[PDB]
Design a binder for this molecule. Structure first.
Ligand SMILES: CC(C)(COP(=O)(O)OP(=O)(O)OC[C@H]1O[C@@H](n2cnc3c(N)ncnc32)[C@H](O)[C@@H]1OP(=O)(O)O)[C@@H](O)C(=O)NCCC(=O)NCCS
Length: 447
């Protein structure tokens, strides 16, 4: 009745919409696959009208065009998480990066630390009552809507209706630009030998009726392919991808055994191919919720037999875990890695487990092999998951237990799970570091 006039009255072009942004403004984007590409390209196109507009967001599948050097006087990129197309700028010095736990984002917005002048969002078209769906995010996207002084909507009819806190009434949105284009999509990873091995070991720590979290990154997929014998698995996770769909139609994941959000896969956001968005649409077995629910340590602590599984770049001899930087170079963020390490530990049922997984080696550019197991982290790296937070660590060669184990015994476990061709250099490094023989009991048969 009134909502359609409101809608009809606020409909414009991407060009005029981006005129709500003024110099000095903090601008924020909807998360991930809810980033409005037309509303973004419009804003970039009109660069030459802005002076130091902060452009915040997290992981992105767009061109990060605003973070390029040329734009350094119209935009300051201020990432809360980075990705290939925006961490250029943090390295070169004109882009910014803010370390935040993912679950804390909504709060900081409420607090007005992350102040928002213009949130831009992609939502689907209104239903009969005038509620657009974000469909593909919830994360901070819901709080930013309530808190943004101005909200631009890139209404795209390709966006799904997905149950949960995904809804926004047209009355909450200052401008609408109707579009039509496919949503972005990531590639499936190559599940090789190393991938497969990391898989089965994680699969030996998941018991039937486990609830799972599976973070951004390649590795939690080879895991999923190793889970086919599992029964009654449930989901409570930041995100889920195509791998989770396979397991769900293979009858393994059914959430019949959860303590909270019974019968549902509870997620904060979706990223994947179109098979995933289509599956998630109008599906009672999926519910998107805000991150300061999904990622909240207190809430994760309530999950049943929780197995978190995330990835890292390197690990040191104390079990300090580095997941978002290579030396002084910023690469991603904590995102939710720590949120689910904290929550699995606080498990009320006492059964929580967090698994950080990684190949033991990585290739460099000169083609030299390097150990991801190190005496010491790379100069200037950020400790992501601290030694006190550490739990399970997992490579192609095995599992190592960091929880309640001494500095010496952790180093022993990790060396255990390292590429054989590095064990002996790692062993020398042990003895140097700790002023103690690598091998603990000694035999009279020698010296
Ligand atoms: C750990 C993380 C960065 C890995 O993601 P990924 O896409 O699986 O990353 P990769 O293993 O491809 O590593 C990236 C590259 O750096 C290199 N690399 C990895 N570890 C390295 C190390 N210790 N030293 C130097 N280089 C390294 C690899 O060679 C790799 O290949 P490329 O250079 O050919 O592209 C990612 O999962 C992440 O950002 N994690 C933290 C956030 C998190 O856990 N969030 C939960 C939210 S759902």
């Amino acid at each position: 009745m009134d909502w359609k006039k409101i809608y009809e009255d606020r409909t414009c072009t991407a060009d005029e919409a981006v005129k709500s942004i003024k110099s000095g403004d903090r601008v924020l984007f909807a998360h991930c696959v809810a980033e409005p590409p037309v509303l973004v390209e419009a804003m970039v196109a009109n660069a030459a009208a802005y002076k130091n507009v902060t452009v915040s967001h997290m992981v992105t599948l767009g061109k990060g065009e605003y973070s390029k050097p040329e734009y350094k006087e119209n935009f300051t990129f201020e990432g809360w998480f980075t990705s290939p197309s925006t961490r250029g700028s943090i390295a070169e010095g004109h882009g910014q990066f803010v370390p935040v736990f993912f679950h804390e984002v909504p709060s900081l917005i409420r607090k007005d630390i992350f102040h928002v002048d213009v949130f831009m969002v992609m939502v689907s078209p209104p239903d009969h009552n005038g509620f657009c769906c974000v469909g593909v995010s919830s994360d901070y996207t819901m709080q930013a809507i309530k808190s943004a002084k101005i909200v631009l909507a890139e209404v795209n009819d390709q966006v799904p209706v997905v149950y949960g806190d995904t809804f926004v009434h047209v009355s909450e949105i200052d401008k609408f630009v109707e579009t039509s284009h496919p949503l972005p999509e990531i590639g499936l990873p190559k599940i090789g030998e190393v991938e497969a091995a990391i898989g089965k070991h994680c699969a030996s720590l998941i018991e039937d009726g486990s609830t799972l979290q599976l973070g951004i990154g390649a590795i939690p997929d080879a895991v999923l392919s190793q889970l086919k014998d599992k029964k009654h698995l449930g989901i409570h996770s930041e995100m889920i991808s195509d791998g989770v769909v396979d397991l769900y139609e293979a009858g393994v994941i059914d959430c019949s055994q959860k303590s909270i959000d019974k019968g549902k896969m509870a997620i904060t956001f979706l990223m994947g191919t179109k098979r995933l968005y289509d599956f998630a649409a109008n599906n009672p077995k999926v519910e998107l919720k805000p991150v300061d629910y999904i990622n909240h340590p207190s809430v994760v602590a309530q999950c049943s037999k929780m197995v978190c599984i995330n990835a890292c770049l390197q690990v040191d001899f104390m079990g300090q875990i580095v997941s978002d930087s290579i030396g002084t170079k910023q690469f991603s963020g904590v995102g939710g890695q720590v949120d689910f390490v904290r929550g699995a530990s606080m498990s009320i049922d006492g059964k929580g487990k967090a698994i950080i997984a990684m190949p033991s080696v990585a290739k460099k550019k000169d083609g030299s092999m390097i150990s991801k197991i190190v005496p010491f982290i790379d100069h200037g790296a950020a400790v992501t998951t601290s030694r006190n937070d550490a739990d399970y660590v997992v490579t192609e060669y095995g599992i190592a237990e960091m929880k309640g184990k001494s500095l010496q015994d952790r180093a022993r476990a990790l060396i255990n799970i390292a590429h054989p061709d590095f064990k002996d250099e790692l062993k020398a490094e042990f003895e140097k570091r700790f002023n103690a023989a690598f091998s603990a009991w000694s035999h009279p048969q020698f010296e």
